[PDB]
Amino acid sequence: IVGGTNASLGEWPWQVSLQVKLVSQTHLCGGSIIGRQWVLTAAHCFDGIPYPDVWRIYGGILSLSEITKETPSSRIKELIIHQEYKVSEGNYDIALIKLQTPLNYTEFQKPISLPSKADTNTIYTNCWVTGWGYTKEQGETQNILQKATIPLVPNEECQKKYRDYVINKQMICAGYKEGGTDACKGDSGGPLVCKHSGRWQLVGITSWGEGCARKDQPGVYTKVSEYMDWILEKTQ
Amino acid sequence: IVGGTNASLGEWPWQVSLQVKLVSQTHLCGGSIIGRQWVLTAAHCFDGIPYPDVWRIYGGILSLSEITKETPSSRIKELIIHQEYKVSEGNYDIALIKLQTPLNYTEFQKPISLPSKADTNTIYTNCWVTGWGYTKEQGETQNILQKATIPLVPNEECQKKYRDYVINKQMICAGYKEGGTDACKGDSGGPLVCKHSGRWQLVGITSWGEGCARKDQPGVYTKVSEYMDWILEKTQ
């Protein structure tokens, strides 16, 4: 994250590191526990490596440094990427992951609530980004989970700050007019969460942005409320 | 290479390193540029990691040190392993990598001539093996490309040493009985080039033999002259 600080154990108990094991293992993507067997991330995280054997998912951890090979992994029973997702595009950037084994919930490992379809036009005032991405452009993966509060930029004002690219209603933008607060490389698939009724809700999934925290270049996030029928369909 | 010495920038411009990139990068194999879009290498270089969008190919570099994010790298569009190759056995050990974008030849990066089908049984005499492999058993990957010359040993002299392994007309052997000069780990898929009529031509591809220059343990190489049919058939 650009322009944030260490999180604590149990602040963000839904956040997971997705890792790839080839010759060596490494963090690539964030995601969110939404149920015992279910993790929600971005489609672009599996662009290059769509083989689920290869992937490891880790929860209740504050630093990647605390993950070895003797650490229990959740593994992909099933990888559901929205059919409409095209491998080199920003649309339909969302994937569901069924785990082989249901997770045991703890102080440190909890699911986040999803919004109603009814929450589509709701205005959130208190929104946070988390992950182990870069703190700067030309940065490097962090050991300690980062967090940052970010204001939602309404969709029309976000469109006009990206003339080249096309902002959907199924996208949601966050950032300051200048600002150093934003998601970066390695924050892919991580949650934008907002507090609405005193509880946390996954409002967005880190998707794409032009640079990290550049002046007037807000981050763009898959808007989860808009995929709630897709989520019920693929989870039953 | 074992028994080798520092090659020199331009000495072997067909030589490429084959590397697995996630965030990190690891030199795993060598190959030979035979075409703007074509690299020839060993099938067993992709047994452990058969996923293509994880591989990177670097040509016209002398050291792996040279490489950072700056350094441009070809990517696999198609990976064509020999249909009769079997991980159990070391026969038909040959693979063609089709590069995404065509290569732009220089002093440092040029193809190499394939042998002709009729060249089978020709005895070549000015034979070189190149690669970044180990310089000793249980050694480590080399920063700077290593060249070494080596005599061929004909089949039936070779097949004597490989009591349980079948050495056939589709293979060449090369090494010194008491010589201790050979191809070690990381040289697999790398070229065995023997200068003949007047130019260097790829005669064999580094294949197998657990051991590096054990006395009386000559390197086995896929005999490129016996897959000319296959190679041209696969370059429609």
């Binding site: 672009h44 920003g90 640079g211 | -």
Partner: peptide, 10 residues
């Protein structure tokens, strides 16, 4: 890796 890619490799 385009300009918009938030993805780690690049």
């Amino acid at each position: 890796c385009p300009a918009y890619s938030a993805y780690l490799d690049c």
